[PDB]
Amino acid sequence: SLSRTQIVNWLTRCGDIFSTESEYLTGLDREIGDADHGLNMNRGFSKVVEKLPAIADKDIGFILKNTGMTLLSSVGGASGPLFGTFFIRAAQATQARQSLTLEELYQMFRDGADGVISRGKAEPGDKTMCDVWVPVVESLRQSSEQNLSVPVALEAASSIAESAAQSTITMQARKGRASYLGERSIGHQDPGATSVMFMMQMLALAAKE
């Protein structure tokens, strides 16, 4: 099972990673966008994390939804609404729970991903966060098929996140500001996708035995 407080620990670690990797993520976004993604993500999660002390004892749905809206209101640019939607849609799917099964994490990732895909309309291979979300979702699905423990599922999901992020360097952007570069977006890792990768690495850690 994955505990509410592990989830709080996730968001905490996301706060850290988005602080530490601001520069790097903004690097990625210079190459193929307006050089703001690390600024955007740090702003958002630093807000997310400042809020944890007040909300940390409410239920998982409450924390994710509230996180969702912070991101929604605070990240800005194109990713903000997408990460927001992810968490908000992840929230519902979480009946006021307090821990989570592998199966409920899958479903919550599944719905979060559907939300981002239906919102921003990216297809696999377009070079966006979705190129990480989809395989991560798919990992959780098979990990759930095999009834692995949450921690090992999450660690598997995590290294797939790494591969999937890596695999975007080669894709040409069909979506968002990076598409403005056309063929010049090939050869560069997507920022958004790197962020999802960061979130999943912190999730793996938060949940570590």
Ligand X SMILES: Nc1ncnc2c1ncn2[C@@H]1O[C@H](COP(=O)(O)OP(=O)(O)O)[C@@H](O)[C@H]1O
Which of the residues 186 through 205 are near ligand X (CB under 6 A)? 190-193
113 binds ligand X (CB under 6 A): no
177 binds ligand X (CB under 6 A): yes
112 binds ligand X (CB under 6 A): no
Query: Can you count the helices (H) and strands (E) in the chain?
Result: 10, 2
141 vs 177, which CB is nearer to Mg ion?
177
What is the residue whose two structure tokens read 């599922």? 153
100 vs 164, which CB is nearer to ligand X?
164
d(C-alpha 111, C-alpha 115), whole Å: 6
Among 14, 71, 82, 156, binds ligand X (CB under 6 A): 82
What is the residue whose two structure tokens read 């997507």? 190
Between 68 and 87, how does the x/- string for binding to Mg ion read (CB under 5 A)? ---------x----------
21 binds ligand X (CB under 6 A): no
d(C-alpha 53, C-alpha 66), whole Å: 13
37 among annotated binding-site residues:
yes
Among 21, 29, 111, 155, binds ligand X (CB under 6 A): 29
Cα–Cα distances (Å) from 42 to 113, 128, 173, 199, in that order, read: 21, 19, 23, 12
Between 35 and 64, how does the x/- string for binding to Mg ion read (CB under 5 A)? -xx---------------------------
205 among annotated binding-site residues:
no
29 among annotated binding-site residues:
yes
Instruction: Compute the half-sphere exposure of residue 89: CA atoms within 13 Å on the CB side of its CA.
Output: 19
d(C-alpha 68, C-alpha 86), whole Å: 7
Q: Tokens standing for 83? A: 């990460």
d(C-alpha 111, C-alpha 106), whole Å: 9
38 among annotated binding-site residues:
yes
Binding-site residue positions: 29, 34, 36-40, 78-79, 120, 129, 177, 190-192
Binding-site residue positions for Mg(2+): 29, 34, 36
